[PDB]
Design a protein around this ligand. Sequence first.
Ligand SMILES: *CCC(=O)N1CC[C@H](n2nc(C#Cc3cc(OC)cc(OC)c3)c3c(N)ncnc32)C1
Length: 310
Amino acid sequence: HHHSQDPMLAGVSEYELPEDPKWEFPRDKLTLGKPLGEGCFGQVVMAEAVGIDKDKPKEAVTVAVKMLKDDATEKDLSDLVSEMEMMKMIGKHKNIINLLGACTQDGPLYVIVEYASKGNLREYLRARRPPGMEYSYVPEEQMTFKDLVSCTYQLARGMEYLASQKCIHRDLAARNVLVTENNVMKIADFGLARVINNIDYYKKTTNGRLPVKWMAPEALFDRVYTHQSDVWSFGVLMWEIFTLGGSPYPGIPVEELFKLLKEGHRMDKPANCTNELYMMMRDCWHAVPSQRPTFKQLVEDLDRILTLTT
Ligand SMILES: *CCC(=O)N1CC[C@H](n2nc(C#Cc3cc(OC)cc(OC)c3)c3c(N)ncnc32)C1
């Protein structure tokens, strides 16, 4: 209840955006809270939004608010506005992080999206590992095989939707998946139409990730990003899930990786994986993009296995 809720006027604010009343959320009903992790494009913070849910208009809801740093550039603003406008176009699905609203007027740009209490899939899985795997300080919340299949099936449904809405993710991985209070799998950073300079697929990111380990060959060499290149990434995502937060091509330097994939070597079958499920992973990792399965096929396959295990 500080000066984040206090309106900004004409003659102080640095930029003016256009308002869409359908999407606009009033600043005085938004209460900014604890910041959610460092890194990625801009800042994300927890907040309480009163009446953001039209199914409970008098009830305050916990939301995540994406915003710009105080040293952000004209392009950083443009890139955030484009991400917002693309999420409006792509529309809503259960298994993606959804645009709830925006504060575009009377101060800095806030983009309000669904809050996921259980955090990202990697940290969610690692925490819910059984005894016998690397863990550090709930037994009821421990994962079963059915839960790993269910989790995979949900993310396939999500990607089927994004793909049907002409959306190419380009960075599908466990770190860009979030898990809600009711264990719903939601895909994140899917709106990013961002162009990047200063590329380095050898140097590790802030939290030690090498995003090249999720990239399809044609995405690396030719910078060709399609729905089929997303399917390769979904393959590596499947590995992450069935290793319960396993780091792909573990201990393999980036140089060796390119040579390894060229020679036709892929990652080994995880312990918790079935032969049927591993053949799905290996189908995703076909060198030829057109020989990979579509997300429509992955959903139908995973729906079949999920009804069987149950
Ligand atoms: C950006 C820093 C980061 O990666 N975090 C991971 C965990 C934590 N965290 N981030 C989000 C988010 C988000 C988000 C924002 C936008 O802005 C338009 C779009 C989007 O999908 C397209 C996703 C978190 C949420 N929602 N809940 C909990 N932790 C979150 C920081």
